[PDB]
């Protein structure tokens, strides 16, 4: 759509490389930051989708 069809999406980050035909619908924040990163955001803590 010329407005941009942002309803199609992919994953940017993950703990580990998944197994063949596994499927991960987790919405948990990826902590690329060193320190524990409670709640929705923080320094290098990523919403993964």
């Amino acid at each position: 759509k010329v407005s941009g069809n942002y309803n199609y999406l992919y994953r940017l980050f993950r703990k580990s490389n998944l197994k063949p035909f596994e499927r991960d619908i987790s919405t948990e924040i990826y902590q690329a930051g060193n320190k524990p990163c409670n709640g929705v955001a923080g320094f290098n803590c990523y919403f993964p989708l």
């Binding site: 063949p20 596994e22 619908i25």
Partner: protein, 98 residues
């Protein structure tokens, strides 16, 4: 033994899988289930009532697969006094295939 619960978080943070036999159906389903800590059913041998509870999950959000059937686990024929049955199951989760 009505069945089993399986997963990696068991609390609707991820997907998880439910196997049960109730008073008629067998059901297999896989959802972000918010399971109970003490999931169970009541009969007390059906002494003054029969099946009337489902205490296993508080919610089931985006179930990616479901299947159902007639009642599995048939009882042995003819009977004998205090004779019993061995039921035996192997579960494997490999190549994305339970």
């Amino acid at each position: 033994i009505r069945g089993w619960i399986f997963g990696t978080t068991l609390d609707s943070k991820t997907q998880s899988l439910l196997i049960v036999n109730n008073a008629t159906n067998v059901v297999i389903k896989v959802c972000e289930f918010q399971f109970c800590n003490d999931p169970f059913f009541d009969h007390k041998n059906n002494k003054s009532w029969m099946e009337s509870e489902f205490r296993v999950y508080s919610s089931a959000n985006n179930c990616t697969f479901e299947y159902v059937s007639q009642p599995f686990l048939m009882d042995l024929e003819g009977k004998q006094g205090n004779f019993k049955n061995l039921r035996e199951f192997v579960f494997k989760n490999i190549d994305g295939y339970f």
